[PDB]
């Protein structure tokens, strides 16, 4: 048990050190909503200006997820190729999961570049259905009321997936995965939160949306 409970600890600690934006900081800024003047400024930008801003933010978020993977006990031991495949396959899946921390379901806003704004903040993109899916996915995830410890373990499971294609040493990913799934269960039962397992999004929904 001290084995599993130490895995839960190092996973959470690794998440703490790589969460990029602390939860308490995002909640303290909730009342800081973008004004209409500021929304129009975003809407007046060009399609390339908004596409490039979001690409930058996502690329920077992936780096933090790379560090999260680096500090998962056992991930560094996996072969180089398996490290690339797992990251390229699930890094952005973890970023989108992390994005729900920046989402406020009370008013349906998201933290972005200093303040909270709705979907209309991203109109210049021309990706209203994509953005709608991101808001909708975050809204459905917010209804789980994830703790930071639950996001730490859940995101680690999203990353360490033995089924990804291209994995050469599957069985050594299977081991690192089962330990994480069991750690997930131990922490959930010790906090009376096992009822959210049947509510998590399917492995497939994380992507196509």
Residue 134 or 183 with smaller CB distance to ligand 9WA? 134
* Beta carbons within 10 angstroms of residue 146's beta carbon: 21
Contact track, its own copies, 125-144, x by CB under 8 A: xxxxxxx-x-----------
Q: How far is the CB of 3 from ligand 9WA (least distance, A)?
A: 31
Smallest separation (angstroms) from its own copies to the CB of 39: 15
Q: Which is nearer to ligand 9WA, 58 or 162 (CB)?
A: 58
Check if the beta carbon of residue 73 is closer than 8 Å to that of residue 172.
no
Residue 48 sits in the site that holds ligand 9WA (CB under 6 A):
yes
Per-residue x/- marks for ligand 9WA, 6-45, CB under 6 A? Answer: --------------xx------------------------
124, 153, 156, 180: which one binds its own copies (CB under 8 A): 124
Rule CB under 6 A: which of 88-107 touch ligand 9WA? 95-96, 98-99, 102
**Sequence-distant (≥ 6) Cβ neighbours of residue 62 within 8 angstroms:** 91, 92, 95
Q: Which partner from the list ligand 9WA, its own copies, none does 93 bind, CB cut-off 5 to 8 Å by kind?
A: its own copies
CA distance 38 to 28: 20
Tokens standing for residue 52: 């490039």
Question: Which region among 42-50, 78-86, 107-115, 183-191 touches its own copies (by CB under 8 A)?
Answer: 42-50
Site for its own copies in 166-205 (CB under 8 A): none
Which parts of this chain interact with its own copies (CB under 8 A)? 44-49, 51-52, 55, 92-93, 96, 124-131, 133, 207-209
Which parts of this chain interact with ligand 9WA (CB under 6 A)? 20-21, 47-48, 51, 54, 57-58, 61, 95-96, 98-99, 102, 110-114, 122, 131, 134
């Amino acid at each position: 048990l001290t084995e599993i409970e130490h895995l839960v600890q190092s996973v959470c600690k690794s998440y703490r050190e790589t969460c990029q934006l602390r939860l308490e900081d995002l909640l303290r800024q909730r009342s800081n909503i973008f004004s209409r003047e500021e929304v129009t400024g975003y809407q007046r930008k060009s399609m390339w200006e908004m596409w490039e801003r979001c690409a930058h933010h996502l690329t920077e978020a992936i780096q933090y997820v790379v560090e999260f993977a680096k500090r998962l006990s056992g991930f560094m031991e996996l072969c180089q190729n398996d490290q690339i495949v797992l990251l390229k396959a699930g890094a952005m899946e973890v970023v989108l999961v992390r994005m729900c921390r920046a989402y406020n379901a009370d008013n349906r806003t998201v933290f972005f570049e200093g303040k909270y704004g709705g979907m209309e903040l991203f109109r210049a993109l021309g990706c209203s259905e994509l953005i709608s899916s991101i808001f909708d996915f975050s809204h459905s995830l917010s209804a789980l009321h994830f703790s930071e410890d639950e996001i730490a373990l859940y995101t680690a499971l999203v990353l360490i997936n033995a089924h990804r294609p291209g994995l050469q040493e599957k069985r050594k990913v299977e081991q690192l995965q089962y330990n994480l799934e069991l750690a997930f269960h131990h922490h959930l039962h010790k906090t009376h939160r096992q009822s959210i397992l049947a509510k998590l999004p399917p492995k497939g929904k994380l992507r196509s949306l």
